[PDB]
Symmetry: D2
Amino acid sequence: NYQPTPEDRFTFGLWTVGWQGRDPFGDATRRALDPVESVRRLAELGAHGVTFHDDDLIPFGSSDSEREEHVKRFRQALDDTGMKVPMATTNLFTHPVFKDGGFTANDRDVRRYALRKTIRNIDLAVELGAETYVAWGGREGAESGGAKDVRDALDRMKEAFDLLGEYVTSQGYDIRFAIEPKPNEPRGDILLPTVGHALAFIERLERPELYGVNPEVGHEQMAGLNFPHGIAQALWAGKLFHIDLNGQNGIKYDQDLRFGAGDLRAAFWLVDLLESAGYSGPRHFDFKPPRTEDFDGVWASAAGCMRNYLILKERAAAFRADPEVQEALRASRLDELARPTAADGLQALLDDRSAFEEFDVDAAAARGMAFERLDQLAMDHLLGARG
Amino acid sequence: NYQPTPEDRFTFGLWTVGWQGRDPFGDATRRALDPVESVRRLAELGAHGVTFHDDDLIPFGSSDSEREEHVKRFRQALDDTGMKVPMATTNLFTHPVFKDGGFTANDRDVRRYALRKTIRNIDLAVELGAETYVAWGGREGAESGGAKDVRDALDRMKEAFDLLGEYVTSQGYDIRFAIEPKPNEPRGDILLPTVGHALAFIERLERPELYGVNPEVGHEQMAGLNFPHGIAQALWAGKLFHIDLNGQNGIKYDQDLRFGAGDLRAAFWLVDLLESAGYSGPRHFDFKPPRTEDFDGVWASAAGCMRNYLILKERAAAFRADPEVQEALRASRLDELARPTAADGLQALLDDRSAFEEFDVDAAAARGMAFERLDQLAMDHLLGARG
Amino acid sequence: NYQPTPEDRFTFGLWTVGWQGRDPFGDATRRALDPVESVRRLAELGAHGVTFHDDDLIPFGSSDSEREEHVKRFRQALDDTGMKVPMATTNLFTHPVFKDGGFTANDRDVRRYALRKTIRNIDLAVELGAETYVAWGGREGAESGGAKDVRDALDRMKEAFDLLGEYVTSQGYDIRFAIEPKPNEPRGDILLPTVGHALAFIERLERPELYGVNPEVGHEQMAGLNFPHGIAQALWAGKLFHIDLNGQNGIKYDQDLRFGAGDLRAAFWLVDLLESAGYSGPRHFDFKPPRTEDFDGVWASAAGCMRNYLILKERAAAFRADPEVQEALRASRLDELARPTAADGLQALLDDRSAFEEFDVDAAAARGMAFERLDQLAMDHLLGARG
Amino acid sequence: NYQPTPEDRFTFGLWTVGWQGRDPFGDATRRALDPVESVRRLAELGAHGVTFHDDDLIPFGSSDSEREEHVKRFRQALDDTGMKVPMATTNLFTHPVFKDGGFTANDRDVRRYALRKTIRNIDLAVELGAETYVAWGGREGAESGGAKDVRDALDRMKEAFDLLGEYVTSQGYDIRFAIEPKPNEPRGDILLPTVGHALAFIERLERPELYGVNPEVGHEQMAGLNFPHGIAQALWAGKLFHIDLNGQNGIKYDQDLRFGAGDLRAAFWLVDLLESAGYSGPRHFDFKPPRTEDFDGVWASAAGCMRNYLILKERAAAFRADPEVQEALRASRLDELARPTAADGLQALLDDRSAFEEFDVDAAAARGMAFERLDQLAMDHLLGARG
Ligand SMILES: [Mg+2]
Ligand SMILES: [Mg+2]
Ligand SMILES: [Mg+2]
Ligand SMILES: [Mg+2]
Ligand SMILES: [Mg+2]
Ligand SMILES: [Mg+2]
Ligand SMILES: [Mg+2]
Ligand SMILES: [Mg+2]
């Protein structure tokens, strides 16, 4: 039946189901949602948690009484539904003061204002019980070559993340940070565009154990890269703290389709990788219900994300647990890929005559790899057509 | 006149001017070149050095007498022309034994054979006086999801690079290693596809001071990324050991056009970045003369690469040394970008009331950035139309 | 000095300089512009005309008195400045009633409403003296495969364009129609995505002499196609009625940069093609001033478009009028490309023994084409470095 | 069981299963196949026919005795297996005499040689009983802007196709012509890059009833376009004469994967479109077995193409024949899309007050479209998870 359970750890953003449909060529098609109503509806669908921007919960320019009133209503809804908040983030892209950037704006006072806004939201997020803080560098980039000195911008971004790490260490919080890469949209070229650039940036920080990545399926597919390879490098580094799941149709604008739409085979291999590696964080959906839909379509899209994940998880487990698949995996020598190359050592490899002087390159080249048979078994298990 | 001089450090690969024109849909249009003739012609054009694959210099399957004869003729040509060899590399992609991979092939004996071939070529490269060794992971990837376990492949690639570093340390050589990223072509998805992935991989190695990157303009433009941003992150990390210059028209197959063709504005900003940062390595051209050309067209393309670089270097220096440009750079607050954000410290930033409580967001948002005026000055200096 | 003159026929849209900066992730950074002020400023910069959407001039839901008042003020500004209106268009994408489409919406009453709105705007455009009407099919497409039956949608689009042609024929107007293609943004896939699809659609209409295309540089570059090839096929068909000039950096979202930015070499070849073919329509700029700029940056961008066109026109004329270039064009046999293949006829070609039986394929294959020398001369003329 | 039958009309090219694995960076991994052996193996798998290039069957430079001997052996194998030949084509891209082009080469004598070669192969194809002749314009394009005058090239291509039509009309053959579009690879930009450009070219020919298109899934996906939309426009024009099925992973080089791999959802919607429209031509597979495979992998890939088509055909028929799907299609108003917009006429539409003056735009905008529910039903039917 593929019914979601709270052990699946499915979470949704408030900006996802609360999107009003304002695109660059059109007005809003839906009215605004109350966050309390969003929590109650998502708890009815069987979700585990919600995430938020600071401006999603408290409107910009609110007084302290309005701030504490919104926080009190939102914690009341969380206590009534039993829902959790596992991640929060700050909005440094909507207001026109951030048009040049946030942490790497050319104006020093804008950079200081962005740091103070982030610190205030980190205090609220620890108050609500979040475990991961996400920084999205949305306005950090340039449309032209001379507008932004990139080495200086990387120095300012390093300084900002070092200050945030110093603050959480001095306060004694247990929250960690995560960086969300994206290649373009809305700037012409965004700093730290991929998972690899984000990981290489994290290794230069002062306390590199507090920082990880938060990759998104759509953002890695906008650069034509392969999302399971990117996720596997992040897992190899030990830095996958949180993940965003959606869909995307090739290299174009950010579509943010529901999960399973877009590249279905890549979604299958991604669910295979996460269930095999034992990733235990939240399964966060960052999608936009299309502006042709009313509220019933919104809730149908939100249910469809979780249903597609549960179907792909069942099919991937059935593919790995099949004896003919295990025979094909031995025939393609994946078990030999898992073996060490030279554990006997460098001197033994240099003295091994079977490794250069007496190695039959023609006999080694004549062997096929049977990858097409393996892939056809994977396609049959995905489509349900084993027979 | 833009005449190349040996102080410019222009180098060419033997595979560049020696390409016979065999593309996937056509036969060769040019006969094979003698490497001695290539050295003499490139010294006549005013180049500084040549680079080589092992199979470019010594054909596959050659005996030891043929090996030493080819090496003796090639060093004789280098001594007669005064040309140098600043970089070498090994060929782990042409022979059909490497169809699944080289360092990360599924076959253990193929991995051991690839390591022994690389070690032999490293000995030859130190004998010829090279300073940088380049590893291109061309066959390391997959066309399908189940063919390659990517975490295990990253373990084998780490093991191979650690063994090579152990060998050069035990021999006492001064040569360093460099990794060339590429997103696809000829596999469907290649491991370590960008500069960011390569840098993040290098930080996990055992002796990370021996390894850097060798980025190529065309390969970063095949993923839709921005090459000056990638080069600037590599310079910020201190890992730019060598660079490949060519041209590319957007996201498609590897064209390897001559330098200056493709994206001319990006070429301008790249030359600006290298001359500003003071990169002192070789300027290596990795281009393919198109198969419609005869040998006169080959030599005209090779001269055109160096001419386009010298023109762009003159225009970029004239753009930076202009007082109206310096006034526009102050008006866009690049000098304020170079200033530290909070050097007074975290506690002073938290107590600063002008940074959150009394900060005029509307007055800060009303200021323009004058980026379009700056970019129009850059375009006028590139086109030569200051007036 | 490259100063624009009214003989250059430079026109701008009101939505171009009137864009407030609202992108999908941010609010507006600039206040709204009066159309009268836009006409006066563009006449001061040296433009020839303006174009408009119906909703740019008259706000949605306006009464008839407000309609005639806006029209009277706008014609007064046109009479005071001497500016013209050579093109108009209708807005069928902003209001949420058009969320599924306009001419090809699934709702019949929405299709009838869209036709009536277009007919009313055509009457206004003939009243202002326009010569070309532009239909942009912005919302005509789908995000999913089952949402839109494409053959039925093409039937409805044919029916709508046939009705508009019947109306202008019955009224005796002299205005013509033009279709603007675009591959995606804001739908996932837009019907009639390229110039070729638009031309093939036009040939199936009832009165195909009234319909042409209106191609845009950015929209053809979002699909990775080559804009001079597309423009040359439209000129070969005799259907280029109007053209939109802007810039675009590869395959991503619609950037709408100023002209000359993006792909400078492609801009050079486009200006070469239009000046060689003698295109006599307006040179229309459809660009967006970036949201980091204030009004001085807006007017600087608008001046920069015209300046870049005048510089490229001078350099292309100097390239064609050069005797060494003419010698290189004879060496690459472009004059032989202009000659007919078999004007002697099919029977003479079949009896010609020099064409198959006695044709030296090796001697024909040995000849080079000298394309690289020709391209280096073109690059030298573009950069101003002939010497 | 999804077993192929001769009523399915599955055909394969000889170049598909006969590909030796020579890619631009590697040598061949498989030996050459006898065409007789290819016919016998494909008849054992359950195919219906084969297609060929002229150089696939008769090697270049063969004498007349060798020509008639190869033809006699090949017709003997066709008579023994009962296989047919429904399509043929000529090779104007491999030999280095065609490096600049074929029908639109800059050399007049090369153009005449290409026409004579094509006419000889057309005689052979009618002798073998083919019904469609395919022209692929592989070398017709340019790497640079000045190398090719595109209007003159379009004149020469029109002249060549008019001569071929005149020849088949004078001989009284019943064969038709088809044009295969492709955006790039191996030239930088190929003339007639998409289906739309090919259709617009066909409408300018002298006898436009003899010419159609032959689209390929991979070639339309290399430009980021949507293949069911392109196929539906070709069916709307009545020009779909033949089709090529393979797979492709986004915008990169021509992968030519087996069918079903790549974009599985797009493959599902394509099979839905062909079975709904009743296309009765051959289902031709143009794929390359990957160079990691031996001959068993070749035959497994060839069987996998037909199996994936039969599975998708069953799932699409089950999706269309479902009552809940039919209810959802009525709720998304596809039946209202099939209705004519104004069959009452232009005057009745202009006098209809319910169409502009009394039309409730807010009530029309408030209705949802239920596209997400429809798409989730389609995904459930594709994955086999109706429950
Ligand atoms: Mg996104
Ligand atoms: Mg996200
Ligand atoms: Mg390359
Ligand atoms: Mg290279
Ligand atoms: Mg646009
Ligand atoms: Mg436009
Ligand atoms: Mg292909
Ligand atoms: Mg094909």
